[PDB]
Design a protein around this nucleic acid. Structure first.
Lengths: 402, 1140
DNA sequence: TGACTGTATGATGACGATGCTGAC
DNA sequence: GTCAGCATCGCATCATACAGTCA
């Protein structure tokens, strides 16, 4: 609606749109008009094409919201043409953890149900450096590159450990431990600046450690296993995490004491595997175990700005589907898991990587390939933002562009 | 690593904001003007504007509303910065002391939050009880005032309406009430809330949500006796209150969106409105009453007043005078007459203020002085578009030229005591003297009874008691005016020749070898007072009295042969008061006593070109504050002269110079004349307020320009400039431009106004061929407005439009080059284009066109289409480098006069920016940062050397040298990436490192190598290496230069020292200010030194300068571990100011 | 002795890969 | 003699039961 006009401007210059829907033209419009959907052709004509906007920027005539927005439709373009699959490499078991190199655009490192890590590069070949796990209880549920020295990775395991080890695979030190097990950590995160590490458990407690030793943490957060912990980029002291408890639990890493005295907790109809603050740090995108996508503002963390209905789900040997932010523009990519019982507007739904606007929630694109029919779970764009790595089909996928 | 130095060469010229009130006192009306980081305050007096104070802030001024709290004598000023620094400021005057003191200060940051799309909004309630801040979506920030909090502490409320257009505090309400427009799926609406800082919460607003047009964009709070809100959209104009509702939709407004407003009358009877096309409207509120009085408001009227520059802000002043703040063109002082002219405009311009912004493209040209040019040009936009030519120093306009070689010295003479104008100009030659009379333009030659013509004159001019004086080598002669004969004659008792002479209205001092004689001028007698002999040969003399008239000088400045000394003697005793050794073996050729800005100086010029200057105390005759500058290599003659009732000093040499004062500090400005030997001031009816200049072959008379650091000539184009290139061999410039024309619907397209392109001497239109998108062309009348692009050839002297080539319909000009290619000796203009259609977001098609201009006409030689937008192109070793969409292509120029591809590189999202040095190629990508390419001669192929893996949205790119790369960025930050010079592994060689980061606060559009700084004249070896200028949206021009690591550390430490004492004006830390800051990240500055900070070291007091020194550790370049003094630090910063 | 907090258990769901058939 | 066409095989979340502590 307002949304129709809002996208088509795409604002400064305004001189398009501004019509109050043309008084409905004259209705929804009544009888035959547009329609909504037909908002599409106009999107086609109304635009004042880019290289027209670039010049207005340099004149100060148009705001960054303009150019940045309009650049993301030049991203959505070349996205639809992303259809090519550049490279694929397997290891074994299934893809679980993904870590994008903070600096290096062709370097991505992925985790396994089996405690195996592959370091992978492009323009290279030169087969990847490997580490093999025991393969039964070795599941590493999350992976973060060591910000300080990129040769090391923080990796959370089903082995009873969250550790830092050189990519040659000779471990440096261990932080959080078990001494018992029949339990393990799942969620993990590190914030470069903060030098905080924070890790979760299946029992629901977190354990947060300063990059060296010395925890004050482990007061049980909530009752059920914690799927993700997100350290906000723009905030050191605070946090958000994910549990089967059907709660988000936004936190404050420092002044939180009282054993689940918190600030805001966000309820969900279901359990939640993803926390994922935006590079702004000013939004929280949550992925729920059956159908939903939660966007939360920093203005009223309670009421989410809105929901995008999406077909994902839980399956045991499916690795929990996590939605993720584009590092640069405002976009979401969730892997779609079609079911009979969705509301779906497009049966039969070939199974694809889906891209949503955000700030709107509409689908601006979808990524599909035959010969990998595989269901998408982990999709995380490259920090540069020109490449998308997907660990899904038992293999890893890089798309990039022709 | 990389070490860089940034200084402002030209302060921002765009006017960002416009607020009226007084602030300086209760009695005066003040005008405050924000120019990005600069805040200017003027008082309107009578058909004028008076500068009282100009201050800088460590921030981009975002909010400028000044409020007046109960029981305060005058308005205070609240300013909010783009990095969200808030402060409340007061104007303080203390005798001659003016200081802007910080009452309250605070950041009010929210650690986490998304800055809103319609930007920062600041409002103040009518009772001055609070500050309202719309910083982020879904949140309304509130600063309680109630005096203290002194730190402006704040709280957030939840706003349920998540997208806010505009907000105002209402008048006439019991509780603070806000009125704002917001948009939802239901359209846009007008809402009201009560603000209760009581409870920290909202309460139901006094008004019913009304429904309003969708593009109502601006809210105006109409004052009492009326209150309420006015809401302006694109189609309509409405008034809003509880039961009253008024709506209007004037057709005149439809053509353009109203963007700003200002209140004329305090009662809210009248408003000024300005739109995107610079139209000025008057809004009137008609009053009516029912019983004994009321507020009714009647109805709404709108009137056209006329046309102005496109206004960023408006403020009415008084007596029909409006100030117009423009971002896209010159700012204006405008008069609204009751008589409309032939066009129907009530607007007439009173004063225009030069704005270089937006500066889109620019170039450095050497044309004016042929040796080294130092000319800087830039661009305006839309109806305001222009070329600007910017020049260091002072030019002269010749009106007469007489060839007299060997002329020695110049003096103006007033033979008639009655008209007070010089009707005479007296010239001197070797062993002889010639008199020239001035009747209008006529001169010739004449005799003057009393003046001799067969001895050489050292001085002549007007003297006391209605007399004329001439001093020769033989004698000094006094001459009557009215009856015309020799009244008195002095000769040395032994008839020795006079060697040096100085004279004012009542005193004569002449030297003879070592002898010195002081004579007074009386009626018909030259009376010889006491006399002495000095220790060495007298080199130079001056007896200019400083003070009032007086006209008796107590002091005598003198230079010696033997000891090369400047000493001040008293008259008549000739008693030594100060002997200053100037050093060296080169004799002083000129010495002068002067007063600048009420301050006194001694200037002493050697035969070297060296010039010493000293503070001079007229009471004791003490010389202080020795300082030395260099003014060419020849000996310099110093002569005082008057301009605009101010005192200046002309310096004649191989680099002629004017010396003058601004901000109580000596400045040295260049004269663009080739050479000057002798000079005198001239004021004839034929040559008013003129100058007589002489070189060794010719003698010239003319006038001189305004005394300022930079000269700006404006050549209006009346359309938008985009790119500019100078072409030596054609003696002209190439300019890309576009004009808007509106659909007449039946015939063709027509222009809004005349411009360079509709007014060219000759013109040419693209005829193709085709593409072919023709034959069912697939283009529309939709979106009736169209851009039309042209290449203009503008003559370098007249700046006239020699030729205009219009491009094809819907063709969009992106790049322009001037160069020769291949084995071709012809010089070509090359333009890169894009086809821009409304229904296609990114271009699929583009062109590179090669033109040759010869005698008026340009034939297109090359004419080759490639598929994509031609973003950039650059001459590359006799080849053409070009950006097309995601592709970097290298073209060869073949003997068939066609463009042939040799090389291709494909790894880009969008290559907007290209720069080259040697064989290296810098490609700037839109989203994919920075790229270092190399051409490989043996393969004829491209190699991708290294890239910057940091995501940056680039606005401009430059190569500083083979290893170091300068980048300008969307968040007003600069950064530098370098090639790892140590090889090692491939990893580091494919990585550019950001070793420099710096927040500019400006958006840079263009970089270019060059300097407006002459050669040395040093010094040299030189202080810094390289000189890169840049132009910005705000019209700011800056300079980047390289430093050694030792110097970088020197200036870095000085900064931290400077940073403890400034003051900060609202107390913003220089730190953080210059810190790299985006939506995503923040960080302190490195690799960059703020030249503006270091330069402001001279503007601090002497004791503060010493406090800055302290344990600071100097090096003079050899083995110095030593401590430093106040004067050593000054000399460096003095050095640093001369680089721009 | 309520409580809770921790251990065996077995229902339910429904994605791959690898195993091996039956058969085009 | 490659082919689809079943089949078993890999600590998730949910529901239970009756053992351990521990303010």
């Amino acid at each position: 609606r307002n949304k129709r006009s809002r996208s088509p401007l795409e604002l400064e210059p305004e001189a398009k749109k501004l019509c109050a829907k043309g008084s409905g033209p004259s209705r929804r419009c009544d009888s035959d008009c547009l329609w909504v959907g037909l908002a599409g052709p106009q999107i086609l004509p109304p635009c004042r094409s880019i290289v027209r906007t670039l010049h207005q920027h340099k004149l100060g005539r148009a705001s960054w919201p303009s150019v940045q927005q309009g650049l993301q439709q030049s991203f959505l373009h070349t996205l639809d043409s992303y259809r090519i699959l550049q490279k694929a490499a397997p290891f074994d078991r299934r893809a679980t953890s993904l870590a994008w190199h903070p600096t290096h655009p062709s370097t991505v490192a992925v985790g396994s149900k089996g405690g195996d890590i592959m370091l992978w590069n492009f323009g290279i070949k030169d087969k990847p450096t490997f580490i093999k796990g025991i393969g039964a209880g070795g599941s590493i549920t999350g992976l973060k590159f060591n910000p300080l020295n990129t040769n090391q990775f923080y990796a959370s395991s089903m082995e009873g450990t969250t550790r830092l080890q050189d990519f040659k695979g000779n471990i440096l030190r261990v932080f959080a431990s078990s001494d018992t097990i029949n339990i393990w950590f799942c969620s993990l995160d590190v914030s470069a600046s903060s030098r905080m590490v924070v890790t979760g458990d299946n029992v629901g407690n977190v354990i947060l450690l300063n990059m060296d030793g010395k925890e004050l943490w482990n007061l049980r957060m909530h009752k059920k296993k914690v799927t993700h912990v997100a350290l906000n980029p723009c905030c050191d002291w605070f946090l958000a995490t994910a549990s089967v408890d059907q709660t988000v639990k936004i936190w404050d890493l420092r002044q939180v004491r009282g054993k689940a005295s918190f600030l805001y907790s966000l309820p969900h109809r279901h359990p939640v595997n993803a926390a994922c603050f935006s590079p702004d740090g000013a939004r929280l995108l949550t992925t729920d175990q059956k159908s939903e996508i939660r966007v939360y503002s920093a203005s009223q963390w309670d009421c989410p700005l809105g929901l995008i209905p999406h077909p994902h789900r839980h399956f045991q040997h499916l690795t929990p589907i996590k939605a993720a932010w584009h590092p640069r523009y405002n976009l979401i990519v969730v892997g779609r898991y079609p079911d009979p019982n969705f509301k779906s507007c497009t049966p039969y739904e070939l199974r694809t990587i889906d891209v949503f606007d955000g700030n709107s929630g509409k689908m601006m694109c979808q990524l599909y390939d035959p010969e990998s029919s595989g269901i998408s779970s982990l999709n995380e764009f490259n920090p540069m933002g020109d490449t998308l790595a997907s660990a899904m089909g038992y293999h890893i996928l890089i798309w990039s562009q022709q | 690593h990389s070490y860089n130095y940034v200084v402002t060469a030209q302060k921002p010229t765009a006017v960002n904001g416009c607020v009226t009130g007084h602030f300086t006192s209760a009695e005066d009306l003040n005008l405050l003007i924000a120019k990005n980081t600069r805040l200017e305050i003027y008082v309107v007096t009578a058909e004028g504007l008076r500068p009282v104070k100009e201050v800088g802030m460590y921030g981009k001024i975002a909010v400028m509303e000044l409020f007046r709290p109960k029981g305060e004598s005058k308005d205070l000023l609240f300013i909010l910065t783009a990095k969200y620094n808030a402060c409340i400021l007061e104007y303080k005057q203390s005798g001659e002391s003016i200081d802007i003191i910080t009452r309250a200060h605070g950041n009010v940051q929210d650690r986490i939050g998304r800055p809103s799309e319609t930007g920062i909004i600041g409002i103040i309630d009518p009772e001055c009880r609070m500050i309202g801040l719309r910083l982020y979506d879904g949140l309304f920030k509130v600063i309680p005032l109630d005096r203290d909090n002194k730190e402006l502490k704040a709280f957030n409320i939840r706003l349920e309406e998540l997208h806010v257009i505009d907000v105002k505090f209402l008048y006439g309400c019991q509780a603070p009430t806000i009125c704002f427009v917001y948009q939802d799926p239901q359209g846009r609406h007008v809402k009201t809330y009560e603000v209760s800082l009581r409870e920290k919460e909202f309460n139901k607003g006094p008004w019913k949500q009304e429904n309003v047009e969708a593009e109502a964009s601006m809210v105006i709070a109409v004052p009492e006796p009326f209150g309420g809100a006015i809401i302006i959209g694109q189609e309509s104009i409405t008034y809003h209150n509880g039961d009253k509702y008024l709506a209007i939709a004037p057709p005149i407004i439809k053509q353009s969106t109203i963007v700003c407003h200002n209140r004329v009358d305090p009662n809210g009877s009248r408003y000024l409105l300005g739109d995107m096309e610079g139209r000025l409207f008057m809004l009137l509120l008609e009053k009516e009453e029912q019983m004994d009085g009321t507020v009714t408001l009647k109805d709404l009227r709108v009137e056209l007043l006329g046309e102005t520059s496109i206004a960023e802000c408006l403020t009415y002043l008084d007596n029909g005078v409006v100030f117009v703040g423009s971002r896209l063109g010159d700012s204006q002082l405008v008069k609204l007459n009751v008589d409309s002219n032939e066009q129907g405009s009530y607007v007439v311009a009173m004063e225009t203020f030069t704005n270089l912004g937006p500066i889109v493209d620019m170039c450095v040209v050497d044309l004016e002085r042929q040796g080294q040019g130092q000319l800087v040009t830039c661009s305006g936009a839309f109806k305001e578009g222009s070329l600007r030519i910017i020049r260091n120093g002072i030019g002269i306009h010749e009106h007469a030229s007489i060839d007299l070689p060997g002329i020695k010295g110049l003096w103006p003479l007033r033979s008639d005591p009655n008209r007070e104008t010089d009707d005479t100009l007296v010239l001197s030659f070797v062993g002889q003297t010639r008199v020239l009379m001035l009747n209008g333009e006529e001169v010739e030659e004449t005799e003057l009874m009393g003046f001799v013509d067969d001895q050489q004159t050292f001085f002549c001019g007007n003297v006391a008691h209605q007399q004329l004086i001439q001093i020769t080598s033989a004698s000094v002669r006094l001459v009557s005016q009215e009856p015309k004969a020799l009244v008195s004659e002095w000769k040395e008792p032994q008839a020795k020749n006079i060697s040096v002479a100085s004279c004012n209205s009542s005193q004569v001092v002449v030297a003879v070898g070592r002898a010195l004689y002081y004579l007074q001028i009386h009626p018909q007698e030259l009376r010889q007072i006491s006399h002495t002999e000095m220790e060495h040969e007298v080199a130079c003399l001056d007896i200019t009295p400083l003070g009032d008239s007086n006209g008796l000088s107590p002091l005598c400045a003198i230079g010696l042969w033997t000891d090369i000394s400047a000493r001040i003697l008293k008259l008549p005793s000739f008693e030594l008061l100060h002997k200053e050794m100037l050093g060296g073996e080169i004799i002083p050729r000129s010495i002068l006593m002067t007063t600048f800005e009420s301050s006194h100086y001694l200037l002493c010029a050697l035969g070297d070109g060296a010039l010493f200057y000293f503070g001079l105390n007229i009471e004791t005759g003490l010389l202080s504050d020795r300082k030395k500058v260099t003014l060419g290599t020849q000996p310099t003659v110093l002569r005082t002269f008057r301009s605009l009732s101010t005192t200046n000093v002309f310096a004649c040499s191989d680099r002629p110079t004017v010396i003058y004062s601004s901000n109580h500090k000596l400045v040295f400005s260049n004269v663009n004349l080739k050479e000057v030997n002798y000079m005198c001031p001239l004021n004839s009816d034929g040559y008013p307020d003129s100058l007589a200049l002489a070189n060794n072959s010719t003698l010239t008379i003319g006038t001189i320009d305004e005394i300022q650091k930079l000269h700006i000539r404006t050549v209006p184009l009346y359309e938008s400039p985009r790119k500019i290139c100078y072409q030596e061999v054609s003696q002209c410039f190439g300019v890309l431009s576009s004009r808007i024309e509106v659909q007449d619907t039946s015939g063709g397209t027509t222009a809004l106004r005349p411009s360079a392109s509709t007014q060219a001497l000759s013109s040419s239109v693209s005829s193709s061929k085709l593409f072919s998108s023709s034959t069912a062309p697939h283009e529309t009348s939709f979106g009736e407005e169209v851009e039309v692009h042209n290449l203009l050839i503008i003559d370098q002297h007249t700046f006239e439009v020699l030729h205009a080539h219009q491009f094809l319909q819907n063709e969009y000009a992106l790049s322009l080059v001037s160069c020769k290619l291949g084995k071709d000796p012809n010089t070509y203009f090359i333009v890169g284009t894009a086809m821009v259609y409304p229904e296609e977001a990114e271009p699929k098609q583009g062109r590179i066109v090669v033109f040759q201009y010869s005698d008026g006409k340009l034939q297109t030689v090359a004419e080759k289409e490639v598929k994509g937008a031609v973003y950039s192109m650059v001459e590359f070793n006799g080849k053409l480098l070009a950006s097309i969409n995601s592709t970097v292509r290298l073209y060869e120029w073949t003997t068939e006069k066609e463009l042939r591809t040799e090389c291709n590189h494909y790894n880009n999202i969008m290559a907007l920016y290209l720069k080259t040095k040697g064989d290296f190629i810098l490609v700037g990508d839109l989203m994919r940062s920075v790229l270092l390419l190399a051409y490989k001669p043996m393969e004829g192929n491209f190699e991708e050397i290294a890239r910057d893996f940091n995501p940056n949205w680039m606005s401009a790119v430059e190569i500083l040298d083979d290893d170091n790369f300068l980048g300008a960025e969307n968040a007003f930050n600069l950064f530098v990436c370098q090639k790892d010079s140590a090889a090692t592994t491939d990893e580091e060689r494919q990585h550019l490192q950001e070793v420099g980061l710096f927040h500019l606060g400006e958006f840079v559009n263009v970089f270019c190598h060059g300097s407006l700084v002459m050669q040395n004249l040093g010094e040299t070896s030189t202080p810094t290496q390289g000189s890169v200028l840049f132009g910005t949206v705000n019209g700011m021009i800056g300079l980047v230069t390289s430093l050694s690591e030792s110097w970088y550390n020197l200036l870095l430490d000085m900064q931290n020292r400077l940073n403890k004492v400034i003051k900060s004006v609202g107390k913003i830390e220089h730190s953080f200010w210059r810190s790299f800051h985006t939506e995503r990240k923040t960080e302190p500055a490195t690799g960059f030194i703020d030249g503006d900070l270091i330069e402001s070291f001279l503007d601090i007091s002497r004791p503060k300068m010493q406090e800055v020194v302290a344990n600071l550790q100097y090096d003079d370049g050899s083995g110095m571990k030593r401590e430093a003094t106040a004067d050593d630090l000054i000399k460096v910063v003095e050095e640093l100011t001369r680089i721009h």
